[PDB]
């Protein structure tokens, strides 16, 4: 039947250099989501019989600092879908995440233990869900396990009289074998953000990616490459390596490094980001975390560690550092 | 006690001719609510004793396509009321539907099996609830069953220093006898939509209606007439509907509505017909398929109500709407 | 585990003189919250063991008249916090009420049986919660009972590159001894309401207060003084006395009177407000109430009984009276 769930993440974050309305740059202290975005949701599954089940998920994301909605402000701004699931496959209709989150995000640190501040610059590949990365009016298929091989795709309508006014589609697959995990996916959007009725909330946007991860005992490591492109021209490539080791069953330590190269009108911009996180689990539901991330950029641009808000100003320097200590609770 | 409930309706809908910002008109494909508006809510009843019970309903409507609120965007945009219920009657305070939804809507196809696209042109009679048809700041009384005879009324404040800035009131009754069901109601609004504090969310508006329905076995039929008036435009709606249950799990429905309107002394005509097939996978989950056709007079255009009044008209006098969808209850 | 709760308050209210867009003033009849603001929420507490428990509260306020959010419109506009609680103290992070609501509000009639219309003029001391009195990005500590002595403090971040751009902090204490209860608190805000990222949702604001209350049998009485100050210049002092007598265990009668003296640019304004309330409890969850409030001001200003909305226009005269009859239900 119906199940209520949620995760609450509240912590204090210090950012070293955030630009001011005046030309200067000052340190920013904030109370908000550190790793995961605070959310609450409803999920259910009704056994219709004959191997068929009706399924639904309604998930709403909010900021525990101010209590407001994020991801645009709708009711169920993260996920809202219903569909039928069989042993053949699952088809779901509604506001959902595309294949890049289904198959690429599990390989990245921002999609696992790292969360927000371990995201790639400006979340250009849309890997982290502490942002409006879901697409509206989406039809999604997810295949069966097929011996660890799972593939799926999504197609998103614009709900406007113009077909390509806000269309999006994606496809991906992943294979898991013991500790080894491999995945790849692709997503495309057409005129993303034009109208309110379309898939991408307010040219041609594309994301490519492939990566792998291995987990032997307490040690888990992974490497991933992603590319985000915008045409009709900006292009960016992200190269990430991440490692998490569980010293204690309750204590895990994670390190990640990302190099980002971007082509904005044919000239190169570079980002190098490194971050460390220690998380201690007080229980299955509650844990405490602490993390520090460092990013320095090339001299032709500035540094910005993604803090969940794209509107946050860049650093005045090529230097920015972010440190967070927080509490995370599930129910 | 308190109960969480909800209905999820997701389907793909095709409209034949929806106008574009440019003069041309194009077909529109959308993923959203086909029959019923997706909603979730909390309902409760506490037995206070002595035949008295406290009741409340908080109901929020949203679109599963984008996850956003409808009906203006408030939290509980469909219904939000509390009140006391006794064997004499029930009084409730809050954002509620008027008598036309209480007594006329059960007779219409748009209020039963048809839903959104089976509504009369532009939902002029306010029969369909896939829109902002509730009224704010409403006092409502509903009588006892009295041998199948139930009557009720509503009174709605403006919550502004001008009383008639957004006043509304309604009254209606319905009688049910074996297969026969009969109902009639009246609703009036004064300066509807003027201020944000008033009953109708952003002259003198009135709605009339009376109809009847009969249900023998798998065959259920009904016919209804409604009239909507605007003062300080006039429209009459004539509807006939039938639903037959081929299989206990499979139902077929057909409906036809003719609408005649007098706007500044000029007559406008609409004829709307629709067919729907629904199969019940369970008590909670079903799948449906439907097709609707509407033709207008050449002095105007056709528009099948799709739940959004801002949706542009057809460029032609012809419009067609087709939907296939999934509906789940929890 | 997690618990869903809520309060529904619906009543009809009559105000004698509310200003109109045209110079005239007309009587206003409204359907809305009489005493308490309608709300729903989720609360939970997980026993982490060893005397430590994780706790959270997510509370949303709405108006049953229109179904809309109040207190700015966010999801959890009243309270949204998570924290850890031990026998030493409790620390919580998120959108919370400051010390003035923790320790001063219980002494006032507006914070107990009176509610909205028993609030001081313009709710200047922020004692009533039928308004946006919570502060964002707040770290709060609440001490143990210490033999009826409870003290606490709050600190609220600006979440902007400027530290004091929308900063707030508060501190307070309360002592309870049999029937007698005494409390005092202090709150300060810097540039309240400037930016969206700060503590107070859209100069220098401070509130002081101290009071005491006694309850012997069915007779309950209290007296309280508060001062609210605004610079960059207004200052106001409120003197309140309140009495509640329970004729029947289910029937209570309440009377309250407040005198307010204000300094606006060096000129004095006077308010005298009197109100009476009778409430009959149909059960522990359901009760019915009736109340009438009268306020008179000096001729250099106007009268306005706080109706939960600060934007409500004043009376055209120095005279205003407010009467409400309503139903209040808990779940």
**B49 φψ region: left (φ > 0), alpha (ψ -120 to 50), beta (else):** left
**C161 φψ region: left (φ > 0), alpha (ψ -120 to 50), beta (else):** alpha
Residues 6+ away with beta carbon under 8 Å from C330? C5, C6, C7, C8, C284, C285, C286
Whether C331 and B95 lie within 8 Å, measured CB to CB: no
What are the tokens at C143? 């001490």
Backbone φ and ψ of B196, nearest 5°: -75, -20
**Minimal-distance CA residue of chain C relative to B75:** C68
Q: After which residues is chain B broken (C to N over 2.5 A)?
A: 202, 232
What are the tokens at C137? 């990005």
Nearest to A65 among C2, C52, C95 (CB): C95
Using an 8 Å CB-CB cutoff, list chain B residues near C29: 157-159, 163
CB B254 within 8 A of CB B293: no
The 10 Å Cβ neighbour count of residue B190 is 24
Whether A66 and C201 lie within 8 Å, measured CB to CB: yes
Using an 8 Å CB-CB cutoff, list chain C residues near B52: 282
Nearest to B94 among C10, C40, C60 (CB): C10
Whether A327 and C83 lie within 8 Å, measured CB to CB: yes
Nearest to C283 among B48, B83, B157 (CB): B48
Look up tokens 């081929």; give the residue: B246
Which residues pair with residue C25 across a beta bridge? Answer: C19
Cα separation, B118 vs C212, whole angstroms:
64
Give the angle B47-B52-B56 at the CA atoms, nearest 5°.
65
Look up tokens 């993390």; give the residue: A291
Whether A75 and B69 lie within 8 Å, measured CB to CB: yes
Give the angle B302-B305-B307 at the CA atoms, nearest 5°.
150
Best probe of the B interface among C9, C30, C59, C67, by most B CBs < 10 A, is C67
Q: Which domains does chain B have, with CATH numbers?
A: 3-329 (2.40.160.10)
How many Cα atoms are found within 13 Å in the side-chain-facing hemisphere of B196? 7
What are the tokens at C167? 């900063």
Chain C closest-CA separation from residue A141 CA (Å)? 32
Cα separation, B114 vs C276, whole angstroms:
52
Best probe of the A interface among C54, C84, C95, by most A CBs < 10 A, is C54
Whether A12 and C84 lie within 8 Å, measured CB to CB: no
Chain C closest-CA separation from residue B82 CA (Å)? 7
Cα separation, C86 vs C49, whole angstroms:
10
Cα separation, A279 vs A112, whole angstroms:
12
Closest by Cα among B3, B65, B44 to B326: B65
The alpha carbon of A98 is separated from its chain's Cα centroid by a whole number of angstroms, namely 11
Backbone φ and ψ of A208, nearest 5°: -120, 155
Burial of B299 (0-12, 13-18, 19+ CB in 10 A): exposed
Whether A285 and C54 lie within 8 Å, measured CB to CB: yes
What are the tokens at B50? 């002595």
Using an 8 Å CB-CB cutoff, list chain B residues near C326: 93
Cα separation, B112 vs A298, whole angstroms:
64
The CA-based dihedral angle spanning residues A31, A33, A34, A40, taken in that order and rounded to the nearest 10 degrees: 150
CB B235 within 8 A of CB B258: no
Chain A positions contacting chain C at CB under 8 Å are 4, 6, 8, 10-12, 18-20, 25-32, 40, 60, 62, 64-69, 282-283, 285-286, 313, 327, 329, 331
What are the tokens at A237? 């490539």
Cα separation, B176 vs C121, whole angstroms:
54
Whether C331 and B44 lie within 8 Å, measured CB to CB: yes
3-state secondary structure string, chain C?
Answer: CEEEEEEEEEEEEEEEEEECCCCCEEEEEEEECCCCCCEEEEEEEEEEECCEEEEEEEEEEECCCCCCECCCCCCCCCEEEEEEECCCEEEEEEEECCHHHHHHHHHCCCCCCCCCCCCCHHHCCCCCCCCCCCEEEEEEEEECCCCCEEEEEEEECCCCCCHHHCEEEEEEEEEEECCEEEEEEEEEEECCCCCCCCCCCCCEEEEEEEEEEEEECCEEEEEEEEEEEEECCEEEEEEEEEEEEEEECCEEEEEEEEEEEEEECCEEEEEEEEEEEEEEECCCCEEEEEEEEEEEECCCCCCCCCCCCCCCCCCCCCEEEEEEEEEEEEC
**Minimal-distance CA residue of chain C relative to B160:** C28
The CA-based dihedral angle spanning residues C64, C65, C70, C74, taken in that order and rounded to the nearest 10 degrees: 60
How, if at all, do strands B167-177 and B180-190 pair?
antiparallel
CB B93 within 8 A of CB C64: yes
Cα separation, C170 vs C207, whole angstroms:
9
Give all strands (DSSP E) within A50-203, no chain letters. Answer: 52-61, 79-85, 89-96, 135-143, 149-156, 167-177, 180-190
Cα separation, A136 vs A138, whole angstroms:
5
The 10 Å Cβ neighbour count of residue A268 is 11
Cα separation, A307 vs C8, whole angstroms:
37
What are the tokens at C156? 């609220």
Closest by Cα among A211, A246, A241, A204 to A226: A211
Burial of B2 (0-12, 13-18, 19+ CB in 10 A): middle
3-state secondary structure string, B13-40?
Answer: EEEEEEECCCCCEEEEEEEECCCCCCEE
Burial of A132 (0-12, 13-18, 19+ CB in 10 A): buried
What are the tokens at C190? 């810097």
Closest by Cα among A164, A178, A189, A163 to A99: A189
Cα Dmax for chain A: 66
SS3 A22: coil
How, if at all, do strands B149-156 and B135-143 pair?
antiparallel
Give the angle B80-B83-B84 at the CA atoms, nearest 5°.
160
Whether C31 and B82 lie within 8 Å, measured CB to CB: no
CB B139 within 8 A of CB C12: yes
Cα separation, B2 vs C29, whole angstroms:
31
Cα-Cα-Cα-Cα dihedral sign, residues B134, B140, B144, B148: negative
Cα separation, C58 vs C39, whole angstroms:
10
Cα separation, B260 vs B135, whole angstroms:
26
Distances from the Cα of B322 to the Cαs of A95, A203, B326, in angstroms?
21, 31, 14
The 10 Å Cβ neighbour count of residue C163 is 14
Residues in chain B: 330
Backbone φ and ψ of B164, nearest 5°: -85, 15
Cα separation, C200 vs C126, whole angstroms:
12
Cα-Cα-Cα-Cα dihedral sign, residues A259, A262, A266, A268: negative
Cα separation, B30 vs B27, whole angstroms:
10
Closest by Cα among C12, C4, A194 to B157: C12
Which residues pair with residue B279 across a beta bridge? Answer: B250, B287
What are the tokens at C78? 């009243």
The 10 Å Cβ neighbour count of residue B3 is 10
Cα separation, C84 vs C93, whole angstroms:
9
Cα separation, B48 vs C281, whole angstroms:
10
Whether B74 and C62 lie within 8 Å, measured CB to CB: yes
CB A77 within 8 A of CB A70: yes
Look up tokens 């306010």; give the residue: B126
Chains near C (3 or more Cβ pairs under 8 Å): A, B
Q: What is the stated resolution of the deposited model, in angstroms?
A: 2.6
Closest by Cα among A8, A214, A219, A222 to A105: A222
Whether B54 and C4 lie within 8 Å, measured CB to CB: no
What are the tokens at B236? 């009459």
Using an 8 Å CB-CB cutoff, list chain A residues near C75: 60, 62, 67-69
CB A75 within 8 A of CB B68: yes
Name the strand (E) or helix (H) holding A99: helix A99-99
Chain C closest-CA separation from residue B240 CA (Å)? 34
Cα separation, A14 vs A324, whole angstroms:
6
Look up tokens 């605070």; give the residue: A38
CB B117 within 8 A of CB B304: yes
Chain B closest-CA separation from residue C20 CA (Å)? 6
CB B49 within 8 A of CB C286: no
Whether C29 and B163 lie within 8 Å, measured CB to CB: yes
What are the tokens at A68? 């407001």
DSSP state of A69: B
**Minimal-distance CA residue of chain C relative to B158:** C30
SS3 B123: helix
What are the tokens at A211? 């990566």
Nearest to A329 among C56, C157, C158 (CB): C56
| Distance between start and end Cα atoms, chain B | 17
Whether A82 and B8 lie within 8 Å, measured CB to CB: yes
Distances from the Cα of B132 to the Cαs of A269, B96, B122, B172, in angstroms?
50, 11, 12, 20
CB C223 within 8 A of CB C241: yes
Look up tokens 């999934």; give the residue: B326
What secondary structure does DSSP assign to A103-122, as a single string?
IIGGGSSTTTTS-STTSPGG
What are the tokens at B319? 């419009």
Residues 6+ away with beta carbon under 8 Å from B195? B158, B160, B165, B166, B202
DSSP state of B69: B
Backbone φ and ψ of C198, nearest 5°: -90, -170
Burial letters A92-101, b for 16+ CB under 10 A, else e: bbbbbbbbbb
Closest by Cα among A297, A275, A296, A279 to A288: A279
Whether C327 and B76 lie within 8 Å, measured CB to CB: no
């Amino acid at each position: 039947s119906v199940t209520l769930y949620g995760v609450l993440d509240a912590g204090i974050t210090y950012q070293s250099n955030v630009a001011t309305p005046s030309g200067s740059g000052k340190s920013l202290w904030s109370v908000g989501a550190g790793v995961d975005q605070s959310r609450f949701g409803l999920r259910g599954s009704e056994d219709l019989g004959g191997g068929l089940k009706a399924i639904f998920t309604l998930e709403s994301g909010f900021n525990i600092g101010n209590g407001r909605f994020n991801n645009g402000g709708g009711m169920f701004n993260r996920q809202a879908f219903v569909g039928l699931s069989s042993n053949y496959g699952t088809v779901t209709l509604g506001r959902q995440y595309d294949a890049t989150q289904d198959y690429l995000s599990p390989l990245s640190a921002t999609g696992t233990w790292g969360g927000t501040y371990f995201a790639h610059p400006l979340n250009n590949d849309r890997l982290n869900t502490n942002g409006d990365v879901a697409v509206n009016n989406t039809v999604k298929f997810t295949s069966a396990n097929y011996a660890g091989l799972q593939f799926g795709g999504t197609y998103s309508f614009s709900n406007n009289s113009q077909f390509a006014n806000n269309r999006a589609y994606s496809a991906g697959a992943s294979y898991q074998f013991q500790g080894l995990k491999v995945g790849a996916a692709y997503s495309q959007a057409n005129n993303a953000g034009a109208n309110t009725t379309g898939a991408t909330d307010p040219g041609r946007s594309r994301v490519y990616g492939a990566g792998a991860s291995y987990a032997y005992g307490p040690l888990q490591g992974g490497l991933l490459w992603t590319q985000s492109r915008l045409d009709n021209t900006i292009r960016a490539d992200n190269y990430e390596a991440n490692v998490k080791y569980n010293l204690t069953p309750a204590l895990g330590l994670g390190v990640a490094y990302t190099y980002t190269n971007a082509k904005a009108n044919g000239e190169s911009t570079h980002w190098n980001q490194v971050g460390v996180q220690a998380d201690y689990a007080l229980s299955k539901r509650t844990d405490v975390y602490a993390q520090a991330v460092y990013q320095r950029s090339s001299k032709n641009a500035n540094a910005s560690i993604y803090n969940g808000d794209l509107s946050t100003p860049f650093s005045t320097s090529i230097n920015q550092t972010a440190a967070t200590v927080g509490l995370r609770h599930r129910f």
